[PDB]
Ligand binder design. Structure first.
Ligand SMILES: Nc1nc2c(ncn2[C@@H]2O[C@H](COP(=O)(O)OP(=O)(O)OP(=O)(O)O)[C@@H](O)[C@H]2O)c(=O)[nH]1
Ligand SMILES: Nc1nc2c(ncn2[C@@H]2O[C@H](COP(=O)(O)OP(=O)(O)O)[C@@H](O)[C@H]2O)c(=O)[nH]1
Ligand SMILES: [Mg+2]
Lengths: 42, 432, 431
């Protein structure tokens, strides 16, 4: 029944926001998982 | 990819080639003067694949007519569409090949080859984007067979990156004009395995059997056999000469049809089977057209497709029909006949539908199969060859031209390797 | 000003481009000659000439001229300047090696010179949108060659793809699995975000929802164009979500390689149908979680979400949206990975979906496009990889690529990279 929403913007044609129903379960940034140049290509 | 350069070599090559040009000219609405008199924009959309546009409304076949004998050329010029051909494109010798592969490949043929290449170069340099070459010839004769394969090798040397396609007619004892046909065929097959990208194996054994057994023609003539050849040639070239998504050019056809370089010998099929006189006929629905794909009775190569497995298949449906019905019927055949398609080449059956039916029919179907069953045709030639070669019969006709026995042994061995290669993929499993 | 350059490669790319640009013109009121009798955001996609004509910021490339020749003879021949429609003579013949090496190497410098001329007209170039098929030799081979060169010339500039995943119902080559794996391997490190469009999913939507017995590319592309327009509407109109190309990446891409979002669109309604009740926000939102409305065939219930974007268009109110999301959570699990919040980023763009007059799609008051990064998309890679393996075990058709200068080792490398990609989707979903 409870939920969180985070308002972002509003414009000529827009209005966006976040929604959170079940927050991150581990806490913190993602923890799981060249070049070239022209010479390298040729 | 646009222009195809067509070459016609020998008696058979010129006879079948002339019929091809009258059949396709009629489909594209071109009369014997070169003028377009049709009433459909589809007829002209890809006209440039086979015809050069000359000054004004006229269309000229991009065809080179070759023979070591003059008579056949005269017969072509005298013909219905004989006047459509470029006069400068008739290249003929005076000294024939006498149904001797050695004369066609090494002696007389070698003397005429440069005059032919000069005409093919003229046609090729005129091209915006040459796809490659299409050769019609017999394998049982001397010119079509020996000179035809010499031309393939000389053309391959100058245009190594172009597609080399042939319509090669296989000899048969049932409709034989010479006792040495097994030698001429074996020597030619050796050349084709190495030098062509795609070969349509047109078997006189199968054409005779269709005429005699199915068309009930007691004594079949070359005219009767050629009616089946021209229907097949029209069918297999449909994708190249009309707007379409599948196999629209010689290279895309080869890429879809040839999984291994040497296995480029196709078994053509056609439905419905008709005789020159039969302008009846009242028949042929979509399920009926589809069923004749596995029908050995409808094969232009004397092989039973149920004796092997299809590596790749191209099926062309012609006439006004449901694309939904075609797709359903085609899927049904693959599901019901699972065992006759290799499991290690996914979605190996490609279908195309062309609104324009061939002449005389409202509905038709053409099949192009790369089947392991084609080994039956090569086995037949090898056994006929060995029966003669074991006793060195008629060998003096070839050694007399400067040939060595080793060439015979090599050609035979290469053809038997081809048979062994087809058998290998017939027995291969998706155990992966 | 934040300009976006659109690149259309091969038949699929060019034909989808025709559908997209036709739709953009209808949305912005631009006529086929570039004239408009007039928000201002459309300038990100259309430049303006001295005569008040609006020209797409796009390049159309094909190795064969047939397809593009239709654009230069067609209704929109005046929309594009001739120099932005580039064609060769010889196609890649459904061969990645021909497209990438043999034929591609001849036209690459010319294509990049045209792209450079378009980029010179930009004050704040955001990056590129690349449309191509996986299956064709140009679509596969030329695209990966171009993507590599674009990374060199346009250092840390955003590149997004609209990739046509092959389907047997509409497939033209037996070698499409080879071309698909070769292009995916080579392009992976050069693309920021790629939206795959499975031709079978589109074929089935046209058959099921639009009652088209035998869907044509024209039918498929019109539907594709609607999804592309939904993704690009917030760049071309003053939107709030996915406002710039960098925002697509930020919102949907948690790891560099896992950059393949699943698109789901609703509603898809037949035009030749009796007047019906307009769908509510709840109804269209429910439709986003139905596998039948997906752009790629796969099962999200068997996967885990890592990001979800809901892009609404037309008569939509935030209260309606939140109520719809709340009811969905009560009935559906909607499982997210441990390290991600269970949530949605929602965007509303006020313009209702525009449809092509005489088209198969009905005009609706409101529509929605959900872009979700799910591990279930790995199922699409697995299907492709298996078909590759079947043929590759026998080296079937390999000679065609080797003959063009490719090495057999490139096939092994491409397949190993795909195995690592499948492994990445598996590792990402673990906890
Ligand atoms: N959705 C969609 N798919 C298409 C279209 N045209 C081709 N395809 C698909 O793309 C694949 C064929 O590749 P193409 O784009 O036609 O070929 P190409 O890029 O021009 O490359 P080459 O012709 O080999 O030089 C198959 O999977 C087709 O189903 C189109 O207009 N729409
Ligand atoms: N189908 C068909 N086969 C032919 C025709 N003419 C000859 N043949 C066959 O071709 C072989 C003889 O070769 P031919 O082309 O006459 O000799 P060439 O002039 O030296 O090439 C034999 O297998 C004949 O049965 C023809 O018009 N049609
Ligand atoms: Mg193409």
């Amino acid at each position: 029944a409870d939920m969180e929403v985070i308002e972002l913007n509003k414009a000529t044609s827009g209005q966006s926001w976040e929604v959170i129903l079940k927050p991150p379960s581990f806490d913190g940034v993602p923890e799981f998982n060249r070049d070239p140049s022209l010479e390298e290509i040729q | 990819m646009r222009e195809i350069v067509h070459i016609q070599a020998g008696q058979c090559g010129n006879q079948i080639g002339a019929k091809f040009w009258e059949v396709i000219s009629d489909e594209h609405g071109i009369d014997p003067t070169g003028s377009y008199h049709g009433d459909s924009d589809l007829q002209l959309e890809r006209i440039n694949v086979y015809y050069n546009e000359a000054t004004g409304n006229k269309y000229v076949p991009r065809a080179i007519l070759v023979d070591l004998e003059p008579g056949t050329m005269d017969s072509v010029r005298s013909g219905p569409f004989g006047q459509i051909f470029r006069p400068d494109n008739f290249v003929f010798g005076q000294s024939g090949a006498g149904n001797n592969w050695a004369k066609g490949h090494y002696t007389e043929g070698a003397e005429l080859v440069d005059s032919v290449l000069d005409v093919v170069r003229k046609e090729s340099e005129s091209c915006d984007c040459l796809q490659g070459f299409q050769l019609t010839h017999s394998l049982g004769g001397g010119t079509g067979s020996g000179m035809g394969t010499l031309l393939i090798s000389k053309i391959r040397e100058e245009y190594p990156d172009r597609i080399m396609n042939t319509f090669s007619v296989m000899p048969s004892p049932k409709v034989s004009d010479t006792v040495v046909e097994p030698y001429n065929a074996t020597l030619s097959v050796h050349q084709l395995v190495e030098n062509t990208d795609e070969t349509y194996s047109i078997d006189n054994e199968a054409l005779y059997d269709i005429c005699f057994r199915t068309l009930k023609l007691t004594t079949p003539t070359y005219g009767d056999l050629n009616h089946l050849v021209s229907a097949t040639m029209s069918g297999v070239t449909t994708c190249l000469r009309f707007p379409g998504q599948l196999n629209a050019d010689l290279r895309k056809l080869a890429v879809n049809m040839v999984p291994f370089p040497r296995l480029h010998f196709f078994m053509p099929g056609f439905a419905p089977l008709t005789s020159r006189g039969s302008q009846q006929y009242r028949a042929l629905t979509v399920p009926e057209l589809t069923q004749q794909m596995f029908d050995s009775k409808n094969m232009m190569a004397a092989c039973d497709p149920r004796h092997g497995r299809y590596l790749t298949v191209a099926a062309i449906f012609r006439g006004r029909m449901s694309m939904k019905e075609v797709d359903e019927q085609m899927l049904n055949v693959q599901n019901k006949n699972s065992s006759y398609f290799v499991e290690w080449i996914p979605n190996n059956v490609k279908t195309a539908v062309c609104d324009i039916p061939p002449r005389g029919l409202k509905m038709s179907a053409t099949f192009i199969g790369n089947s392991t069953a084609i080994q039956e045709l090569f086995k037949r030639i090898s056994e006929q060859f060995t029966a003669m070669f074991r006793r060195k019969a008629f060998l003096h006709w070839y050694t007399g031209e400067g040939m060595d026995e080793m060439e015979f042994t090599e050609a035979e061995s290469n053809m038997n390797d081809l048979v062994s290669e087809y058998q290998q993929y017939q027995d291969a499993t998706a155990d992966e | 000003m934040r300009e976006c350059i659109s690149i259309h490669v091969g038949q699929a790319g060019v034909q989808i481009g025709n559908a997209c640009w036709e739709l953009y013109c209808l949305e912005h009121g631009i006529q086929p000659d570039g004239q408009m009798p007039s928000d201002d955001s459309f300038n990100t996609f259309f430049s303006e000439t001295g005569a008040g004509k609006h020209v797409p910021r796009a390049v159309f490339v094909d190795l064969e001229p047939t397809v593009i020749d239709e654009v230069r003879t067609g209704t929109y021949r005046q929309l594009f300047h001739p120099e932005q429609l580039i064609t060769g003579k010889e196609d890649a013949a459904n061969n990645y090696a021909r497209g990438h090496y043999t034929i591609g190497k001849e036209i690459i410098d010319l294509v990049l010179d045209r792209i450079r001329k378009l980029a010179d007209q930009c004050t704040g170039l955001q990056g590129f949108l690349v449309f191509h098929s996986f299956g064709g030799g140009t679509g596969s081979g030329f695209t990966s060659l171009l993507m590599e060169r674009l990374s060199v010339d346009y250092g840390k500039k955003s590149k997004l793809e609209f990739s046509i995943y092959p389907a047997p119902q509409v497939s033209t080559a037996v070698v499409e699995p080879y071309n698909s794996i070769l292009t995916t391997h080579t392009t992976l490190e050069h693309s920021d975000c790629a939206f795959m469009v499975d031709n079978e999913a589109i074929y089935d939507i046209c058959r099921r929802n639009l009652d088209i017995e035998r869907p044509t590319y024209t039918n498929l592309n019109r539907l594709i164009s609607q999804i592309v327009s939904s993704i690009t509407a917030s760049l071309r109109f003053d939107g709030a979500l996915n406002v710039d190309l960098t925002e697509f990446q930020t919102n949907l891409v948690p790891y560099p390689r896992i950059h393949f979002p699943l698109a789901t669109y609703a509603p898809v309604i037949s035009a030749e149908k009796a007047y019906h009740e307009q769908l509510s926000v709840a109804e269209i939102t429910n439709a986003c979680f139905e596998p039948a409305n997906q752009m790629v065939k796969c099962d999200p219930r068997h996967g885990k979400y890592m990001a979800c974007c809901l892009l609404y268009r037309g008569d939509v109110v935030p209260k309606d949206v939140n109520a719809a999301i709340a009811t969905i959570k009560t009935k559906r699990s909607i499982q997210f990975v441990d390290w991600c919040p269970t949530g949605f980023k929602v965007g509303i763009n006020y313009q209702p979906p525009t449809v092509v007059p005489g088209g198969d799609l009905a005009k609706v008051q409101r529509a929605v496009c959900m872009l979700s990064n799910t591990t279930a998309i790995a199922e699409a890679w697995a299907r492709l990889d298996h078909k590759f393996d079947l043929m590759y075990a026998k080296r079937a058709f390999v000679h065609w690529y080797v003959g063009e200068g490719m090495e057999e080792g490139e096939f092994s490398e491409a397949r190993e990279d795909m195995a690592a990609l499948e492994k990445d989707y598996e590792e990402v979903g673990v906890d």
